[PDB]
Design a binder for this molecule. Structure first.
Ligand code: HEM
Ligand SMILES: *[C@@H]1O[C@H](CO)[C@@H](O[C@@H]2O[C@H](CO)[C@@H](O)[C@H](O)[C@H]2NC(C)=O)[C@H](O)[C@H]1NC(C)=O
Ligand SMILES: *[C@@H]1O[C@H](CO)[C@@H](O[C@@H]2O[C@H](CO)[C@@H](O)[C@H](O)[C@H]2NC(C)=O)[C@H](O)[C@H]1NC(C)=O
Ligand code: NAG
Ligand code: NAG
Ligand code: ASC
Ligand code: CA
Length: 595
C-alpha cells in the first residue's frame, strides 16, 4: 500500500550493467534493486522506530513524558551507575590480542556510519549546545545527573547533536525518522577507498597511471607510506597539540584518525593497496591505471572479508557462529544486504573491549623509549605520536603483543572513553562514549531491550528476578531495575551488552543473534562476495585462502616476528614465528597474458 521512495539522497544511479567492479557508492550490487546497500541512504529498520512521539523525537526529550509509564534515566546517570569502574588490573582478555578490538572497529567503519547533522553549523547555536545546554532541534544535550563530578568542572551538560536523517536536514511531521548510513553496507573496503566518488577520487594517485593510492608528501615512515593529511582546518589532530601541528589523515572513511591504533590499521591497508598495485604492474605492464587500481581494490576487499568471516566472527560469535552464519550457499539477490539501525548499536559491543593504554614496542618487543605506554585518551585524534614519535611498527607490535580488554559486567567501559573522550568541535577531553551511545540509541528511535529479545526469540524478563536470571547477575539487575523501572525500558546498547557471553564467544545471546543475522545478510546479499562463483577464479580464490593478518604486517611494516594467529593472545617470543615462514599472497593467478 505504501511508498517506494522518499529521500534527499538519490543522485544519479546509472548502472554499468556487466562491469567487474563494485561502484564506490555500493549502487548496482543488486540488479533487481540498484540502491540496496548503497551509501547515503536510510539504515534499514528491522523493527519500527520507537520515538517519544511516534515520529522523530527521542525518549527522554520531553521531561513530563514517560516511556511505558516511567522516566528514561539520564544517559550519564546510567553510565555512572552501571558502565564505569576505577580498577584496570584484571580486566584484560586472556585470549584476545589488542588486534581483536581494532579489527572490530575496522570492520565496523567499513559497514556503517550515521554522522551528526549541521544546519546551525558555522554558527554558535552549535556551540550554543555546549555552552548554554538548551535542548532544541538537533541539539539534544547529555545533561549531568545530581552527584556528577563533571558538574563541578564541565558545566551543565556534554553537548550532543542528533544524527542525520532522510529527506531533509530539519523538519519531520509525516513519517518516522530514519537515520542515514553514509557508507556502503557491503564488506567492500569502503573505509580505504571511500563511499563517495568525490572522495574516492581525491584519495587516488592520478599523477602516475600506476594505480597507486595517493600517499603522504610531508612525511614518510622508514620509507614506507603514510596517508595524506586531510588539509582541512581547523583540524582536531592539530588541536590536541598545536606545537606538533600534525593534521589528521585523509582516508576512505572520515573517522580514521579518531584514535592512533585505528589510524595505524588504515595505514597497513593503504600500504597493502600500493604493494598490490606494484606487484600487479610488474606482472601485467599492459594493465592500465584503472585496471591496476580496480584489481587491487578487489583484492583488498576480499582480504577484509576472509579475515572477518574466517578469523574474526567465529571468536566473536563462538558457539552461535553456526546458528547464524552457516555454510556459504552462494549469492542470493533476495537478501536485504542493508545495515539495520540496531546493528550500528549492537556492534558497539566493541567499546567494552578497549583497554586503557596503548604500547609501543621495539624490535625486542620491549617498552619503546621512556613513554612507551600511553593512556588511551591522549591518543584520540593523535597523529603526531605516529609521525614524530616512532612510526607504526611500535604500535603494530603492541597490537599483537598486547591484549584486548575483556567485557566485564562489573567493569564495562574504561574511563579513558567514559570520562576522557575527545570529540571534534569541542575542546575538551571530557566526553563519555557510553552516555553518548545511550543518547544515540534514543536518538535513532531504538525499541527497548525486550522487543529485541522478542525479535530474537528470547525471554522477556518483566521483573527484577527475571533480569537477574537473564543477566546471571543479582547486582547488575538491581541497578538496572532501579534506573529503568522495567526491563522493557532498558536501552538496547546496555541491555545487549550486559548479558553474559556465549561459550567461546565474546557477546551474549541477544547480541550473537543481532550481530549474526547482519553478517549473514552481509555475505549472502553481496553479488561481489569473494567466493560468489565468478568474481575470482579458483586459482585466485585458492590463493586468497592463504591470507593472514600476519602476512599483512610482514609485507607492510619492518617487523620480522609475527604470530600464526594474530587474534588470540600471543606472547613473545614463544607464540612468535618468523615472517619468512608465513605463507604469502601468490598473485600469479592474476597474471593475464592476454595482451
Ligand atoms: C578506542 C576505540 C574506539 C573509540 C575511541 C571509539 C569512538 C567512537 C565514537 C566517538 C563514536 C560515535 C558515537 C555516537 O556519537 O554515536 C563511535 C561509534 C561507533 N563505534 Fe566506536 N570507538 C572505538 C572502538 C570501537 C570498536 C572497537 C567498535 C566495534 C567492534 C566500535 C563500533 C562502533 C559503532 C558501530 C559506532 C556507530 C557507527 C555508526 O555511526 O553507524 N567502536 N565510536
Ligand atoms: C604518485 O606516485 C609517484 C611515484 O610513483 C609520486 O611521484 C613523486 O614525487 C616524488 C617525491 O618524493 C619525486 O621523487 C617524483 O617527482 C615522483 N616519483 C615518481 C616515481 O614518479 C607521487 O608522489 C604520487 N602522487 C601523489 C599525489 O601522491
Ligand atoms: C605536542 O607535540 C610535540 C611535538 O610532537 C611534543 O614534543 C616532543 O616531546 C618532548 C618535549 O619535551 C621531546 O622528548 C620530543 O623530542 C619532542 N618532539 C619534537 C619533534 O620536538 C609534545 O610532547 C606535545 N605536547 C603536548 C602538550 O601534547
Ligand atoms: C583461544 O582461542 C582459540 C580460538 O579462538 C582456541 O582455539 C584456544 O583454545 C584458546 N586458547 C586457550 C589457551 O584457551
Ligand atoms: C534467498 O533469500 C531469501 C531470504 O533470505 C530466502 O527466501 C531464500 O530461501 C534464499 N535462497 C535459498 C536458496 O535458500
Ligand atoms: O568511530 C567513530 O569516531 C568518529 C568521530 O569521533 C570522528 O569523526 C565517529 O563519529 C565514529 O563513528
Ligand atoms: Ca562498506
Amino acid at each position: 500500500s505504501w511508498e517506494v521512495g522518499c529521500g534527499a539522497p538519490v543522485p544519479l544511479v546509472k548502472c554499468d550493467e556487466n562491469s567487474p567492479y563494485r561502484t564506490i557508492t555500493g549502487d548496482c550490487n543488486n540488479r533487481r534493486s540498484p540502491a540496496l546497500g548503497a551509501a547515503n541512504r536510510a539504515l534499514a529498520r528491522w523493527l519500527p522506530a520507537e520515538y517519544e512521539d511516534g515520529l522523530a523525537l527521542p525518549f527522554g526529550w520531553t521531561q513530563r513524558k514517560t516511556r511505558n509509564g516511567f522516566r528514561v534515566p539520564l544517559a550519564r546517570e546510567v553510565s555512572n551507575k552501571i558502565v564505569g569502574y576505577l580498577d584496570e588490573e584484571g580486566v584484560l582478555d586472556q585470549n584476545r590480542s589488542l588486534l581483536f578490538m581494532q579489527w572490530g572497529q575496522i570492520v565496523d567503519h567499513d559497514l556503517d556510519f550515521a554522522p551528526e547533522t549541521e544546519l546551525g553549523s558555522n554558527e554558535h547555536s552549535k556551540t550554543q549546545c555546549e555552552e548554554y545546554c538548551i535542548q532544541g532541534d538537533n541539539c539534544f544535550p547529555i545533561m549531568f545527573p545530581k552527584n556528577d563530578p563533571k558538574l563541578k568542572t564541565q558545566g551543565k551538560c556534554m553537548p550532543f547533536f542528533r544524527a542525520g536523517f532522510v529527506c531533509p536536514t530539519p523538519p519531520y511531521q509525516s513519517l518516522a525518522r530514519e537515520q542515514i548510513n553514509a557508507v556502503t553496507s557491503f564488506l567492500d573496503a569502503s573505509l580505504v577507498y571511500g563511499s563517495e566518488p568525490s572522495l574516492a577520487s581525491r584519495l587516488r594517485n592520478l599523477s602516475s597511471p600506476l594505480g597507486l593510492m595517493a600517499v603522504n608528501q610531508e612525511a614518510w615512515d622508514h620509507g614506507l607510506a603514510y596517508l595524506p593529511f586531510n588539509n582541512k582546518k581547523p583540524s582536531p589532530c592539530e588541536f590536541i597539540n598545536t606545537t606538533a601541528r600534525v593534521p589528521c589523515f585523509l582516508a576512505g572513511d572520515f573517522r580514521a584518525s579518531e584514535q592512533i591504533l585505528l589510524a595505524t590499521a588504515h595505514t597497513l591497508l593503504l600500504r597493502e593497496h600500493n604493494r598490490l598495485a606494484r606487484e600487479l604492474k610488474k606482472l601485467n605492464p599492459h594493465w592500465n591505471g584503472e585496471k591496476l587500481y580496480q584489481e587491487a581494490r578487489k583484492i583488498l576487499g576480499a582480504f577484509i572479508q576472509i579475515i572477518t568471516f574466517r578469523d574474526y566472527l567465529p571468536i566473536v560469535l563462538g558457539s552461535e557462529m553456526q546458528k547464524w552464519i552457516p555454510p556459504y550457499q552462494g549469492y542470493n539477490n533476495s537478501v536485504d544486504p542493508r545495515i539495520s539501525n540496531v546493528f550500528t548499536f549492537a556492534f558497539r559491543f566493541g567499546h567494552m573491549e578497549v583497554p586503557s593504554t596503548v604500547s609501543r614496542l621495539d624490535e625486542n618487543y620491549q617498552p619503546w623509549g621512556p613513554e612507551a605506554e600511553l593512556p588511551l585518551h591522549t591518543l584520540f585524534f593523535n597523529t603526531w605520536r605516529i609521525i614524530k614519535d616512532g612510526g607504526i611498527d611500535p604500535l603494530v607490535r603492541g597490537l599483537l603483543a598486547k591484549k584486548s580488554k575483556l567485557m566485564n559486567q562489573d567493569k564495562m567501559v574504561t574511563s579513558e572513553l567514559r570520562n576522557k573522550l575527545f570529540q571534534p568541535t569541542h575542546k575538551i577531553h571530557g566526553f563519555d562514549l557510553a552516555a553518548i551511545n545511550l543518547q544515540r540509541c534514543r536518538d535513532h528511535g531504538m525499541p527497548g531491550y525486550n522487543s529485541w529479545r522478542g525479535f530474537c526469540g528470547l525471554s522477556q524478563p518483566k521483573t527484577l528476578k527475571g533480569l537477574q536470571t537473564v543477566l546471571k547477575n543479582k547486582i547488575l539487575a538491581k541497578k538496572l531495575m532501579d534506573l529503568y523501572k522495567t526491563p522493557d525500558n532498558i536501552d538496547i546498547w546496555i541491555g545487549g551488552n550486559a548479558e553474559p557471553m556465549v561459550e567461546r564467544g565474546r557477546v551474549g545471546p541477544l547480541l550473537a543473534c543481532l550481530l549474526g543475522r547482519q553478517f549473514q545478510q552481509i555475505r549472502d546479499g553481496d553479488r561481489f562476495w569473494w567466493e560468489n562463483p565468478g568474481v575470482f577464479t579458483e586459482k585466485q580464490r585458492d590463493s586468497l585462502q592463504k591470507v593472514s593478518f600476519s602476512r599483512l604486517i610482514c609485507d607492510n611494516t619492518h617487523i620480522t616476528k609475527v604470530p600464526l594467529h594474530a587474534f588470540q593472545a600471543n606472547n613473545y617470543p614463544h607464540d612468535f614465528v618468523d615472517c619468512s615462514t608465513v605463507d604469502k599472497l601468490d598473485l600469479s593467478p592474476w597474471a593475464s597474458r592476454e595482451n
